[PDB]
Every structure is written in C-alpha cells, then in structure tokens.
C-alpha cells in the first residue's frame, strides 16, 4: 500500500522516497492512525520542500485529523514559519477550529509563536 509508505516517507523527511512514491501515484490524501495526511506529517516535522510538493499535487490543504486539526494548525502550534506562509498561500483556512475550539492563531498564541501569530492575524 503506497499511501501507508507515503505517510512514513513524508514524516521521516525522505525527499527521494516521497518523489518515487508520488511518481507511482501514492495517495496524497492517505491518513494514518491519527487521521493525519502526508501534508499534516510534513508540516509537523517541518519538511518545507515536502510540504511544497504535496501542495503542487492537490493535497487537501484543509484536511482534518482525528482532533480536528488542519496542517496549518500543526504548523502554527510547533512554530513552522515558512510552512505557515506556504499553507496560507495555498488556501489554508485561518478560521478552522479544532476539537478544542482553537484556530491556528489560537495555537500560535498558546505556544508562544509570536511572529506566526502576527502573520495569521494579518491574514484574518
């Protein structure tokens, strides 16, 4: 199952493996046990180039995990500034609330990510 392999390749940041799997049509919207897509996993780990290739390939920028987080939630929570910018450019929803009622902005505030919180507020 190529979707399962793409999830792990994206999580571990193996750019060559990501390219081979996508060249074989691995499902870019596959989900892991927590409902995370390859885009969620690359956003969480901070793999900017993998985020970018997934966005050029029709990954759902606003897919939600089992806790209601989008990839932008993860990037805002853990402080991935460049990834926040590319997700916003690709149409990430700044108003999406997770199952704790938090937007990406709220997660940026809660985690002390001041520059990202400013970027998200200007995009509100």
Partner 1 sequence: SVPSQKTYQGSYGFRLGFLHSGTAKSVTCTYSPALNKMFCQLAKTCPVQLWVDSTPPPGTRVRAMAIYKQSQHMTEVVRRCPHHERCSDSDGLAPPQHLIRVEGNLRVEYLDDRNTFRHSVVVPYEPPEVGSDCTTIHYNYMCNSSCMGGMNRRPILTIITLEDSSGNLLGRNSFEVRVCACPGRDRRTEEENLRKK
Binding site for partner 1 (CB under 8 A): 5, 8-9, 11-14, 17, 32-34, 44-46, 67, 78
Q: How far from 60 is each of 38, 52, 57, 119, CA to CA, in Å?
A: 10, 12, 9, 21
CB of 29 to partner 1, least distance (A): 18
CB of 56 to partner 1, least distance (A): 22
Task: Compare residues 33 and 95 and give the one whose CB is closer to partner 1.
Answer: 33
Q: At what angle do helices 71-78 and 114-122 cross, to 10 degrees?
A: 140
Task: Compare residues 35 and 123 and give the one whose CB is closer to partner 1.
Answer: 35
Distance CA 86, CA 43 (A): 10
Distance CA 82, CA 73 (A): 14
CB of 33 to partner 1, least distance (A): 4
Task: Compare residues 15 and 91 and give the one whose CB is closer to partner 1.
Answer: 15
């Amino acid at each position: 199952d190529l979707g399962k392999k793409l999830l792990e390749a994206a999580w571990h940041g193996q750019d060559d493996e990501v390219r081979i799997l996508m060249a074989n049509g691995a499902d870019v919207n596959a989900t892991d046990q927590s409902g995370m897509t390859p885009l969620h996993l690359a956003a969480w780990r901070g793999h900017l180039e993998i985020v970018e290739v997934l966005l050029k390939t029709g990954a759902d920028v606003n897919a939600i995990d089992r806790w209601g987080k989008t990839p932008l939630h993860l990037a805002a929570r853990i402080g991935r500034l460049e990834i926040v910018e590319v997700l916003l450019k690709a149409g990430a929803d700044v108003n999406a609330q997770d199952k704790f009622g938090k937007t990406p902005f709220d997660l940026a505030i809660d985690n002390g990510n001041e520059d990202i919180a400013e970027v998200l507020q200007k995009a509100a």
